[PDB]
Amino acid sequence: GMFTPGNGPVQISAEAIKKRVEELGGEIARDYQGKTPHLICVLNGAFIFMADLVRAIPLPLTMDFIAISELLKDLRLPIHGRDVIVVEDIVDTGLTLSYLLDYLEARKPASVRVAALLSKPSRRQVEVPIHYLGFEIEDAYVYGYGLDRAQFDRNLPFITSIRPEE
């Protein structure tokens, strides 16, 4: 053991995350009963959230991975006519998600909903929907659970943060 949280104001334990992710998985399973969703993980930050979330959705489903920052990595599976669920790590300005939604809508999916681990509503620059949200937080420098701190710390099992000064 060596996992150490930062001194920032945002702190979410692995247990709190686990419980919240299972609740979200449950809601998705419920809302999509009778359907076969297609989950798209936004790399790299959402990969752990994606891994825990899919295991909490008892439904037949497919998935894909996309990297955006400008489309870094493209989709491989069709989305036309599919019930798509975008899986985001964090939504702050909403600029990236807005682009992604327009990009997906262009292919005419049957529907699209968004699942996001974190949301910083005070940073919104554009209106974007979040149907399944893990936690709403203040605008602090957060990391862990897939999110990085200069490429490091994505392996922290919890979400933590640092102070503005540091």
Place this chain on the structure above:
Amino acid sequence: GMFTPGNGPVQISAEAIKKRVEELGGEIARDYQGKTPHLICVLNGAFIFMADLVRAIPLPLTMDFIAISELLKDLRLPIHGRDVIVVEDIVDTGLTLSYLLDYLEARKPASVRVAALLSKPSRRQVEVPIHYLGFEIEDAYVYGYGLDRAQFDRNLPFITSIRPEE
């Protein structure tokens, strides 16, 4: 709940996987004490193994994702001079891993070791090393825990399989 195992000969519970992944994470943490590994997840199949494994390695580390089947997705972070750890879902023929190793060695990393969830040694067509292995199995059609069955079932929290006939 609705997760159902196939009728195949290979069956590995979520609990067995969890325990094994924590043991592997422990070994890596031990072997790499004093170092900063760079873990490369082979998409799409190894993403869940990757998520659980990194959370079991109490060390500062970075990561990247690559998709190969022909390089489908390329690396973004440098590996030259880095202690690299390839994270594979399954090694059967060893052809794909062999290519990947040659591709990485070309960039002159400080070192390279391989972590793989599953291994089907009876399918080997070329010699490749596996330093951290989850489980060795027979040549059965396996899926779950990130591995797909025609794009479906990657969300199963356990590893299961089907019979040759089906």
